[PDB]
Design a protein around this ligand. Structure first.
Ligand SMILES: N[C@@H](CCC(=O)O)C(=O)O
Ligand SMILES: N[C@H](CCC(=O)O)C(=O)O
Lengths: 267, 267
């Protein structure tokens, strides 16, 4: 039971921003990742469809007997999370609130910004979360549909990427924000470009990175932590797309040479 | 449910450091504090008797419809958390693990120190928590019985307090540790002196503060956080000993003026 793995789902490589942090904070925890690279991008897809696809990724991992489910995707979290948490016996973790509480703790301006997919922005989740914590804070949300493709295409270091991020982020310019929430688990791979565009006066919040911290206490809370020894079975990486392009960017961002990945089918 | 208070039970006035921390981190949360001042200290008492008392406090608070139970006492937590956590229908939190988690996270040389009451240290609760997370860490546990009286008599600023603290903490001086957990509700008031004695290489963990950060994450997890929105009632303070003397220590620490407390009978 406790030696069972922790499963992480996402639409593609975004989930890896959370996974990377889990390797660093929870070294003795076995992980099983699933990225629906085939149906990506979610962020615009209709909520109902996203709820569907997400459940599909869940069922795929449930058959592998995971002890905890981490929806390392803002889009999925925003629409799916309550429903899947209520339905499953194991604990389910989303990435919105951890990012929201971290932003609230770091802002000195009370002027916070958040960027994410269409779906995340439309759900007004981050607005709704921040309001319930500190209503005096002014939140400015912005959808950035062009970002995710830049990451999936493994061109998040390109000059092209820099120009897109720049023009897209100009809409948040001159609004006095001192904190910007990376409301998409894909955005941390663009962090250096985003930090450069926003300036050194703006603190970036990595939503998924903050989530691992919550994961850590939940393991103790539900007393289902893995024994303090590096797992026997290695970490499993699945993708519904080119298992090869996955390994390409996965191994680079994670720093894992010869990172294995296996393509699969859903729905 | 969401509008109901959070309950904190403690041996006496110590737990007020945890309650004060909650007033800071959770301003919208209604609190209900219970302190068995008529029977403290708990540290020098045998575990069983402590388990019995803790249960009485818990019961009394449950009858008052709290949504979450916080065992602010390390001594109490070290022996009664498991049972009470398992028995109650509401979330039950203790102050040991949040601190061990934080310590393990910050140590760079694998040498964590821990101080508290004879009871706390005698239960080996911290050594157990830390080694089940990271076996490679050498845990040094020391009981410091003079610290509580030193704090309860409002003598924690005196140059005298520094000599005593320096003398008691001499043992830990030759271990080479870089992390020391303040495993007792009283110790936060001695933090400045303890810090100077332990030096700039040592990071002090405030179990009270780490615990409140968990309650915050747990409020969001179970989605039972009190609305930011309106409206709240007075915090409630209960004690098994003199309410007058308590109302003194309360305003003398929480700062709050006219804090009214009620004396009650448990068993
Ligand atoms: N992983 C992205 C989803 C991007 C997409 O599928 O469009 C998120 O954090 O919401
Ligand atoms: N509250 C106790 C100290 C006071 C007592 O001895 O009862 C603790 O934190 O261990």
């Amino acid at each position: 039971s406790n030696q069972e793995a922790i499963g992480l789902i996402d639409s593609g490589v975004g989930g890896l921003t959370v996974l990377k942090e889990a390797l660093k904070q929870l070294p003795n925890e076995r992980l099983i990742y699933l990225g629906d690279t085939a149906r990506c991008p979610y962020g615009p897809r209709p909520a109902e469809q996203v709820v569907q696809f997400t459940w599909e990724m869940a069922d795929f991992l449930l058959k592998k007997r995971i002890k905890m489910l981490v929806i390392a995707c803002n889009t999925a979290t925003a629409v799916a999370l309550e429903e899947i948490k209520a339905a499953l016996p194991i604990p389910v973790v989303g990435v919105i609130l951890p990012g929201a509480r971290a932003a609230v703790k770091v802002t000195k301006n009370n002027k916070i910004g958040v960027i994410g997919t269409l779906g995340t922005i439309k759900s007004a989740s981050y607005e709704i979360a921040i309001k319930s914590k500190a209503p005096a804070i002014e939140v400015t949300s912005l959808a950035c549909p062009k970002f995710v493709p830049i990451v999936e295409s493994n061109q998040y270091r390109s000059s092209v990427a820099k120009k897109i991020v720049a023009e897209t982020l100009q809409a948040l310019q001159l609004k006095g924000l001192d904190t910007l929430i990376l409301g998409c688990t894909h955005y941390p791979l663009l962090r250096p470009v985003i930090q450069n565009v926003m300036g050194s006066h703006v603190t970036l919040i990595d939503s998924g990175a903050e989530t691992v911290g919550e994961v850590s206490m939940l393991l103790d809370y539900f007393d289902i932590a893995h024994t303090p020894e590096a797992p026997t079975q290695p970490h499993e990486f699945y993708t519904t797309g080119s298992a090869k392009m996955f390994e390409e960017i996965a191994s680079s961002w994670l720093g894992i040479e010869n990172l294995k990945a296996q393509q699969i089918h859903l729905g």
